[PDB]
Design a protein around this ligand. Structure first.
Ligand SMILES: [Cl-]
Ligand SMILES: [Cl-]
Ligand SMILES: [Cl-]
Ligand SMILES: [Cl-]
Ligand SMILES: [Cl-]
Ligand SMILES: [Cl-]
Ligand SMILES: [Cl-]
Ligand SMILES: [Cl-]
Ligand SMILES: [Cl-]
Ligand SMILES: [Cl-]
Ligand SMILES: [Cl-]
Ligand SMILES: [Cl-]
Ligand SMILES: [Cl-]
Ligand SMILES: [Cl-]
Ligand SMILES: [Cl-]
Ligand SMILES: [Cl-]
Ligand SMILES: [Cl-]
Ligand SMILES: [Cl-]
Ligand SMILES: [Cl-]
Ligand SMILES: [Cl-]
Ligand SMILES: [Cl-]
Ligand SMILES: [Cl-]
Ligand SMILES: [Cl-]
Ligand SMILES: [Cl-]
Ligand SMILES: [Cl-]
Ligand SMILES: [Cl-]
Ligand SMILES: [Cl-]
Ligand SMILES: [Cl-]
Ligand SMILES: [Cl-]
Ligand SMILES: [Cl-]
Ligand SMILES: [Cl-]
Ligand SMILES: [Cl-]
Ligand SMILES: [Cl-]
Ligand SMILES: [Cl-]
Ligand SMILES: [Cl-]
Ligand SMILES: [Cl-]
Ligand SMILES: [Cl-]
Ligand SMILES: [Cl-]
Ligand SMILES: [Cl-]
Ligand SMILES: [Cl-]
Ligand SMILES: [Cl-]
Ligand SMILES: [Cl-]
Ligand SMILES: [Cl-]
Lengths: 242, 239, 239, 239, 240, 242
C-alpha cells in the first residue's frame, strides 16, 4: 500500500492519469485497475473537464498483467477482466472530455483504454495489438468497431494482428501522430475544448453523441472469460512464438 | 460420495434431479457445471422436454454458501456468472421446460424454477429471492416478465418470501400439485412438447420470448463484481 | 356474387365476410377485397371499422379449396397478403370491432384478434392450428393479448378454445348474443368519435406494441420453407 | 402562503400539495416547487417519497386560471415542466407512494400514476380528459399500468373512473380509508429501507419500462400544434 | 401579412424554397418557420420529387431570429425552438429528395436546416457554426453526428466552433464546394436522381436508409430549452 | 435438370469454394441455383468450415435474379424465389465462417447483394455493379448496402438505381481493393489463414458481435415490396426499358 502504480496530477481544467509501472510495461494489475476506477470516479464527482491518460517509461500500457496468472484462480482472472471492462465503460461514457497519449508498444486492454478516450494521439513509432481473441477474450470489440468500422475491425481483430501509427491514423484510430514534445500543447488545446461548455451541457453532449452498447459489451466480455478452460487458453497463447 | 445431479433419459424427456440432501440442493460450482453440461447435451439431442426437480426436501436453496469465506471475490463472481449462463440456457431453451418445486426454495434455486415455462409447486412450497439484500442482481427482469413490474417490486423490493398461494395468484406457478401427481404432469408435459415438430417448437419459443440476456448478464456481473461482495454476503448471512 | 359486403355509414364501415357456403374462408379474392376496403376506409379516416361474417361463422381462415393445384409460391403469397391485411387492421388509426360466432379457424381467428374491441356469441369457438404445419401467423399479436404463458399453451398444442375460455384469458371483452350486437356497434361508433381523427390516430400509435417487421419476417420464413404444401397435406389428414 | 409543504423524517419525505382553495391545481410555481423538492430528495437519497393533497382532493392537474393571459408558448413550457416532473417521479430511486382522495384530474392523475404504490379512498375519482383538446400526457405510463385495452377504453373516451374501477384495473393497490394511511406509510417506509440505497436504485432502474424520450416528444408535439390554446379555450368555455 | 419571407417556386420535378429575409441574414422568425412547415407539408401531400433549399441575399440562414427575444417569454422561445425541430424532422424524414445550397456565413438552426437535406453543397467561401451549446441548446446534435461521425461531431460541437467550406467537404458535410454558377447544373442532376424512382418506392428507400431518432432528438431539444434560466443563458452568449 | 451442375463446390479443410456455374446465363440465380447455394452454405455451417469463397465461372460473378421464364411464373412463384434469395443472403451475411467474394464482369441485383453479404470483397479493375430493382419496386439488400457504404453513398447509388464501377466501389468501401484474377489464389490463401487464426467458437462470436443484425426488418421490407399487386407488370416495364 506504499507504491504508486497510478500518479494523478490535478489541475482546475484537467487531471492527468499517468500509468506508473514502467518496469512492467504499465501492465494492468488488479491494483492499477482499481486505482484508475477510483481516480475516474473521483474526477466525475468533481466534474473535471478533461481527463488525460499517459504512460510512464517506454509505453502507454501492455494491458492485462499476466505475471503470476498461474497462481490466480479462473474466478480471480474473470473478476480482473470484468473490472477492466467496468473501467473502460466509465472512461468511454465520461462526462469529461478524455485524451490519451500513446507511445511504444501497446497491447490488449492497454489499447482498449486508449480507444475509450475521445481524443487519441500517438508517437510516429507507436504500435498497437489486441490479441485476446487468440485465447477467446472478447474485450473492447464493439468500441473498436465503432471507431474504425466493422471491415477494419474484422481485419485487425480477426487475425489478432499488430498495427502501427500510420495504419492507426489511416483508419481513424488516432487523430494524428505527435512527438512527445508536442503533447503539452495538445493537452492545453484539449483543456480549452473541454471547458468551452458548462459541465451539465458537456455531459449531455457526450451522452447524446455516444453509441451506448455497455450491457452487450459487458455480457460478451463476461461470457468469453467465464468459459471453462480460460487459464489453459491463456497458457497456450503465452507459449506462442510471436 | 454420490453425484450432485441425477439425469434420467427417456425418448421425449430428460429429468434433471438436483441431489444434494445435506446442502438443501444448494448450487455448488460442480452442480452448476453438471447442469450446464446436461442441458447442453439435451439441446444437441433436441430433447422435446426438460424436467427439473429436487430430491429430498426441496427444489433448491440457490447458491451454496458453504465455505464462501475460503473462496476469493473472483471465485464467487465466476460461480454467479456460471449460474446466470445456466439460467439463460434454460430460459431460452428450444425444448419445453418443466420445473416442479416443493419445500423452501431460495435465490438462484427460485431463478432456475422461474427459467422454466411450465412451473408447478406443492401447496406447501415457499420461495424467496433475498440476493438484493447483499446487492446481487440475479433473475430480476425474468421475474418481472412473469409477474409484472408491480408484483416484482412488491416482492423483490423488500427481498421477501412468498408462498404457493401468492405464487399462483401472481402467475409464478400455473397451479399447485402434490408430489404424487408429478409423474402425471411430466406425461402431460411430454405430450405438449411433442405436439409440434422440433424446428417449429424451437421457432415458437424464440418468437414468444422477450430476450434481454445481455442486459441480465451485465447487471449480474456489475452487481457481483462491486468490491466488498463477500462482506455483503457475510452481513446478510448474519441477519 | 362478391365475397365481401361493405356497408358505409358516416361514423362506421362494416365489412361483412360473405362466403357463407364456404365458412367465410379467405380466398385470395376475399383477402384482396378486404385490403382494398380497409385501405379505402383509411384514406377516408372512417372512425370505426366493423368486421363480421354472414352465415354460421366469422371465418374459417385460409381457403384450402384446391390448394393442391396452387404452387408453393402462390400459397406463400396468399399467406403474406393475409399478414399484410392483419397488420393494416391491427395498426389502424380507426377503432376496430370484430363480432364472432360459430366455429372459427386460423387466419379467421387472427383477423378477429387484430381488432381492438372483440366480442363473440356464448357458443362461439376458436382454433389456431397453423403451427401443426409449421405456419407462424398472428403468434406475437396473440401473445400480446393473452400473455406468453397462455399463448404457449393454446398455440403449442393447437387446441380449440370456447367463448368462456376466450373471455377468461382476455381474448374477448365479453360474450354477447347477436341481438346485442347492433348496440355494441353503436357504443363503438361513439367511443371512436369521442376524439378528433388526428388525436385518435396519435393515441392508437402511442398505445400499440409494434413488431410488424418481426411478425412478417417470421410468417415469410415459416411459409417459404421447402415442402410447405406437403406439411399442409399431412395436417389436413389428421384426426 | 406556499403551494407545497414538505415534511422530512429520516426514512421519508412527504410532499403535501397545499392549494386547497384551488383544488391543488398545478400552477407553474407548484410544479417548480415539486421539481426542486424531488431533486433535493434524490440528492439526499431519501428511501421513501409520499405524495398527498391537503383539503378536498389530491390534485385537479394543470391550473387553467388566467390561461387567457398565457401565450401558447407559456402553456407549452408549463406542460413540458409537468412532464419533466412526472418523469423524475416515475424514474425515482426512492420508493414512491401516493394517497388520493376526492376528485382528481389530468396531470393530477398523472402525478398519482407516476408513483409506484398508489392508494385511494373509497369515494375517490379520476379523469384524464386532455385528449379532448389534443393533449398527449402520461399516455404510455398509464398504458403500462392498466394495459393497452383498459387505457384505450379510458383515454379514448376521456372518461371518469371511480375507486372500484381503479382497483379492478390495477391503477390502485387497494382502496383504503384515510384512517389506514399512517399504517400504509409505515409499511412503505419499511419496504423502502429493506435494501441499501444503491441497490434500491438499481432495482428500480432494472424493473422500469423507460420510454421517457418518446413520452416527452409526444407531449411536446401535442402542445406545440398551432391552435392549441384555442382548443383549450373551446374545452374550458362556460356558456 | 404582405411580406414574402419564404418564396416557393413550383415545378413538376422540384419545388425551390428560397429563404427571403436577406436584410435579416435569413434568420428564422416564428413566421418563416411556419411558412417552411406549411410548404414542406404541402410538398409531401403533393409528392414533389425534389425539394431545393436556398437563401436570398448574402447567406443561407443565420438560424433562430434573436431580434426582440427580450420581449418574448421563456415559453415563447421554447415554442419557437420546438417548431424549428419539428420543421427539421419533416425535412430530414422527407419522402422527397432534398437539396440544400449554402453561401455566406451560416449559424445554428440554419446549419441544421442545411444538414437536414440529403444533398448539400456550399460556395468555397461559405462558413458554418452551431454555437447553441454555449447557452445549453441541444439542437440537431444526433443528425450532425450521423453525417460527420461522432469523432468529428465532438471536435466541432464540443467547443461550439466554426468550420469553413474546406473542412465541411473533408468531413463529408458537403458533396462539393461549388460556386453559384454550378448550381443550375446541380439542381438538374438532383431532379434527375429524384425522379429515377416512383413516389412510393422513393419514400420507402428514404425510410429504410434513415437512422430515425426523432423522439430522442425532440426530447433532448425540449429538455435543453425548458431548463429554467434559458433566456439568461442566451443573454450571456449574445453579450460575448 | 438433375444432370446439370449449376453450382460447383470445392471442399478443402480450411475452405469451401462455391462457384456459380451458369456461364451461358451470366450466372443468374434460378430457383435451383438459389436452393443449391442454401444447401451448400447450410452444410458448411454444420461442418464449421472456416472460410467460404464465392466466385462465378465465365465472364461474371452473377447477374442476379434469372428473369428467363418469369412470364410463365405466377406472382407467388416470383415472391417465393425472392424470399429464398433473401434467406440465402441472410445466411451468408450472418455466417460464422469468414466469407470471401471475388467479382468480375458486369454484376446485377441479387448478384451484387450476394457479393455484399461477404466480409472480404474483391473485384477486378474492370468489374461493374448495379442494383436496379428499385426501378420495379424491389427492396432487396438495401440496409446491408447502406451499412457498408454509408447512408450518403447508398442514397447516391440506390436513389438513382445506377451502376457503379470498380474505382467507385473501392472509393466507397464496397470492395477491400481491386485485384486482377492472377492475385486471387494468394487472396484465398490469406483469407484461409485469417479464418483459421481463431478457434471456431471465437470466430463465430467475433462475427456475431461485429454484425448489425436487421434480418427481420430486411426480410419484411423484401416481402412487402415483392408482394405488392402488379409486381410482374412492374418487372415487364423495367425489362422493356432501353
Ligand atoms: Cl514498475
Ligand atoms: Cl493482480
Ligand atoms: Cl482455478
Ligand atoms: Cl514511441
Ligand atoms: Cl489485455
Ligand atoms: Cl485483446
Ligand atoms: Cl447494450
Ligand atoms: Cl456474447
Ligand atoms: Cl489451468
Ligand atoms: Cl449433499
Ligand atoms: Cl463450489
Ligand atoms: Cl412441500
Ligand atoms: Cl442464490
Ligand atoms: Cl436472489
Ligand atoms: Cl391461502
Ligand atoms: Cl447494471
Ligand atoms: Cl354513422
Ligand atoms: Cl359462399
Ligand atoms: Cl384463392
Ligand atoms: Cl354461435
Ligand atoms: Cl389459416
Ligand atoms: Cl393458425
Ligand atoms: Cl419488428
Ligand atoms: Cl423467424
Ligand atoms: Cl389555496
Ligand atoms: Cl402559473
Ligand atoms: Cl374521498
Ligand atoms: Cl391537466
Ligand atoms: Cl389529461
Ligand atoms: Cl408524437
Ligand atoms: Cl429582410
Ligand atoms: Cl418571431
Ligand atoms: Cl459565399
Ligand atoms: Cl439557432
Ligand atoms: Cl446551435
Ligand atoms: Cl427516438
Ligand atoms: Cl436529454
Ligand atoms: Cl449456363
Ligand atoms: Cl427458376
Ligand atoms: Cl435481382
Ligand atoms: Cl436490385
Ligand atoms: Cl430487424
Ligand atoms: Cl417495408
Amino acid at each position: 500500500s506504499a507504491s504508486l502504480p497510478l500518479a494523478i496530477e490535478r489541475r482546475p481544467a484537467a487531471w492527468t492519469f499517468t500509468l506508473s509501472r514502467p518496469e512492467k510495461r504499465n501492465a494492468l494489475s488488479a491494483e492499477l485497475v482499481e486505482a484508475l476506477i477510483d481516480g475516474v470516479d473521483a474526477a466525475h464527482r468533481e466534474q473535471v473537464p478533461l481527463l488525460v491518460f499517459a504512460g510512464a517509461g517506454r509505453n502507454f500500457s501492455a494491458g492485462f498483467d499476466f505475471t503470476d496468472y498461474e497462481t490466480q484462480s479462473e474466478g480471480d482472472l474473470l473478476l480482473r477482466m470484468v473490472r477492466i471492462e467496468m473501467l473502460l465503460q466509465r472512461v468511454a461514457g465520461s462526462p469529461s472530455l478524455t485524451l490519451a497519449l500513446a507511445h511504444g508498444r501497446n497491447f490488449g486492454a492497454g489499447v482498449d483504454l486508449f480507444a475509450a478516450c475521445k481524443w487519441r494521439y500517438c508517437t510516429p513509432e507507436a504500435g498497437f495489438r489486441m490479441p485476446g481473441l487468440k485465447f477467446g477474450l472478447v474485450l473492447g470489440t464493439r468500441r473498436f468497431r465503432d471507431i474504425v468500422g466493422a471491415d477494419q475491425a474484422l481485419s485487425i481483430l480477426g487475425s489478432a494482428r499488430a498495427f502501427d501509427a500510420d495504419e492507426a491514423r489511416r483508419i481513424g484510430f488516432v487523430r494524428d501522430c505527435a512527438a512527445q514534445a508536442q503533447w503539452p500543447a495538445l493537452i492545453d488545446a484539449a483543456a480549452e475544448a473541454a471547458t468551452a461548455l458548462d459541465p451539465a451541457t458537456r455531459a449531455t453532449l457526450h451522452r447524446v453523441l455516444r453509441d451506448d452498447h455497455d450491457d452487450a459489451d459487458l455480457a460478451a466480455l463476461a461470457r468469453s472469460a467465464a468459459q471453462p478452460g480460460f487459464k489453459a487458453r491463456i497458457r497456450d497463447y503465452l507459449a506462442q512464438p510471436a
